[PDB]
Amino acid sequence: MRYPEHADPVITLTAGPVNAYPEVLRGLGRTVLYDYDPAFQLLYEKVVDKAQKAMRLSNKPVILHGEPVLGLEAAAASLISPDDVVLNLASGVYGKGFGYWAKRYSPHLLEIEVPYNEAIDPQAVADMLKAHPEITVVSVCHHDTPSGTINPIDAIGALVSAHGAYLIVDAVSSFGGMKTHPEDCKADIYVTGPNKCLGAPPGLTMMGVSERAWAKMKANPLAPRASMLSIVDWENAWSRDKPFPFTPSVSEINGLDVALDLYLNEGPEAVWARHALTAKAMRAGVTAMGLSVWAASDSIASPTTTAVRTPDGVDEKALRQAARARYGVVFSSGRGETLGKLTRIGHMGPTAQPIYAIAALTALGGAMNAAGRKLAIGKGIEAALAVIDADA
């Protein structure tokens, strides 16, 4: 049998977009209220409250009404001005990409760059900051998803705080799937969204903003105002007694409401545990069948996405095509400099359950073997299962 390209797949195991929780999809279907209906004004305020609780924030997170690339661009546009010297940390596609937005808003850019299967070394950060007292803003990506790797942002954030600089963190693909919060890494801007680990569709940004960041953005004549790119316009919009700068994405807010309830009710620690276990089982299976995890070391591999290095000679695009056509299972490609180099299996929200690692391993292995590899698929499944069975 073959799955037609025009027909829906059986299991989507991608790293974004991802399958949304069924409850979230039903939440999207709630009656759409007028945004100034008192019932919606209250709901919106309470959604911000839920986000604050989930993010362990001392102040209100800002919800912006576009998917998190908006948050990233708006952060650069608002916080970075030409007086700033920015240190951008790049260990992958998103990290490198952020530097382009930094350069748009200040001509002064320093970077620490590592190959796209590595993590930023905190020692290198400490040394760079010491050598460059002029640095005023530092940007970092927590989980640089197209590589399936994690940066040590809490240690980095403490170094940056000691230096006296502002920290911008991209935690879009880590928040809700592992332990991370704005406070944990002394973030001044912490950008995330519900469209990865939290199991909602793309459309909203959740942004932690420090008091110091608020003061810097509000002072900056170049910060966007009366714009889609404005953070400052949205400062007070959480309040049931305040207007919205422009019309909020009402149905997405209904989805976010549900997604936050699911996360908070399950227990964040429990949610992080099943992401990590699914990922751990995946990696064990990958290695046992004869493939290589992309990450330079297991220690930096993400608990919310496994990137699998394409064996030299295998056509990675054809591989993903074969996994869907043969088994109905959909994986993510790489992106930018990781495109063609690896395949990504998301372990996010509803797919952060260890049984999905078993499904992913079988489709990935079967597709590899169809491309002429000689993987020990059974051995792979048994190693993944041993991880599941060993979990304490």
Query: Interaction with a second copy in 62-121: which residues (CB under 8 A)?
Result: 65-67, 69-70, 73, 100-101
Q: Which stretch binds a second copy (CB under 8 A): 26-34, 83-91, 162-170, 208-216?
A: 26-34
Closest approach of Cβ 189 to a second copy, in Å? 16
- State in angstroms the smallest separation of the CB of 25 from a second copy: 4
Examine residue 195 and tell whether it contacts a second copy (CB under 8 A).
yes
CB of 52 to a second copy, least distance (A): 20
Query: Reduced to 3 states, what is the DSSP secondary structure of residue 231?
Result: coil
Instruction: Return the range that interacts with a second copy (CB under 8 A); candidates 13-21, 80-88, 131-139, 144-152.
Output: 13-21
Quick one: 291 or 363, whose CB is closer to a second copy?
A: 363
CA-CA distance, 39 to 62, in Å (whole number)?
20
Q: Does 220 bind a second copy (CB under 8 A)?
A: no
Any contact of residue 44 with a second copy (CB under 8 A)? no
3-state SS, 171-203, equals CCCCECCECCCHHHHCCCEEEECCCCCCCCCCC
d(CA 232, CA 132): 30
Whose CA is closest to 352, among 3, 2, 10, 14? 14
Site for a second copy in 127-156 (CB under 8 A): none
Query: What would you report as the CA-atom Rg of the chain, rounded to the nearest whole angstrom?
Result: 21
**DSSP 8-state symbol, 300:** G
Nearer to a second copy, 6 or 372 (CB): 6
**Gaps (C–N > 2.5 Å) in the chain: which residues precede them?**
none
**390 touches a second copy (CB under 8 A):** no
Q: How far is CA 165 from the centre of its chain?
A: 23
Residue 87 CB, nearest distance to a second copy (Å)? 21
From the CB of 123, what's the least distance to a second copy, in Å?
A: 32
According to CB under 8 A, which one of 7, 83, 269, 374 is a site residue for a second copy?
Answer: 7
The CB-of-40 to a second copy minimum distance in angstroms stands at 8
Pairing of strands 189-192, 205-209: antiparallel
Site for a second copy in 328-347 (CB under 8 A): 328-330, 332-333
* From 37-45, 121-129, 174-182, 213-221, span contacting a second copy (CB under 8 A): 37-45
Cβ neighbours for 154, distance < 8 A, ≥ 6 positions apart: 180, 184, 185
Q: Is the distance from CB of 152 to CB of 182 less than 8 angstroms?
A: no
Of 177, 182, 203, 208, the one binding a second copy (CB under 8 A) is 203
- Binding to a second copy (CB under 8 A): which residues in 256-275? 266, 273-274
Binders of a second copy among 49-68, rule CB under 8 A? 65-67
Q: Which is nearer to a second copy, 72 or 137 (CB)?
A: 72
282 to 167, 174, 306, 362, 365: CA distances (angstroms): 32, 17, 7, 11, 12
DSSP 3-state assignment of 65? coil
- Does 315 bind a second copy (CB under 8 A)? Our answer is no
19, 351 in Cβ contact below 8 A? yes
Positive or negative, the CA dihedral 325, 326, 327, 329 is: negative
Interface with a second copy (CB under 8 A), residue from 81, 147, 173, 362: 362
**Residues marked as binding for pyridoxal 5'-phosphate?**
67, 94, 145, 344
**Residues marked as binding?**
67, 94, 145, 344
